[PDB]
Amino acid sequence: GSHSEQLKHCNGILKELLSKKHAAYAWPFYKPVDASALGLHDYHDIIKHPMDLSTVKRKMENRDYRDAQEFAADVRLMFSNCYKYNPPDHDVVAMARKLQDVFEFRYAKMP
């Protein structure tokens, strides 16, 4: 209903995205993409605004999100970056779709 009640609900969503239940498809999103280590050609030229769950967690922990909409935008940016950069048949795209299914359903249940 209110900003704080909506933010509490978003903290609940983040907790689920970082739970053991979803870890089999969430782990590539736990930390920022390390383009050098992975040999991700032109990653930082194609992706202007990198995002990952550790960044979303740091922002939630410090109360940096003013509303639920800011939180949604960051999570969605993380999935959108993954779809934009990677080939459609890469395993990480399938993991991203799986985690996003979890996010979208819980975010839609926000009162």
Q: Which is nearer to ligand 87D, 72 or 92 (CB)?
A: 92
Q: Is 92 in the site for ligand 87D (CB under 6 A)?
A: yes
**Which residue in this structure is represented by tokens 């935008």?**
73
Member of 4, 38, 70, 105 binding ligand 87D (CB under 6 A): 38
Q: How far is CA 65 from CA 24, 29, 38, 39, 84, in A?
A: 27, 19, 30, 32, 25
Question: SS3 string of 15-64?
Answer: HHHCCHHHHHHHHHHCCCCCHHHHCCCCHHHHCCCCCCHHHHHHHHHCCC
Member of 2, 20, 24, 34 binding ligand 87D (CB under 6 A): 34
In the complex, the smallest distance separating the C-beta of residue 94 from ligand 87D, rounded to whole angstroms, is 9
**Cα 99 to Cα 96: distance, rounded to the nearest angstrom:** 5
In the complex, the smallest distance separating the C-beta of residue 51 from ligand 87D, rounded to whole angstroms, is 9
Binding mask 52-91 for ligand 87D (x = CB under 6 A): ------------------------------x--xx----x
**Cα 91 to Cα 54: distance, rounded to the nearest angstrom:** 21
Please give the residue ranges that form the binding site for ligand 87D (CB under 6 A).
28-29, 31, 33-34, 38, 82, 85-86, 91-92
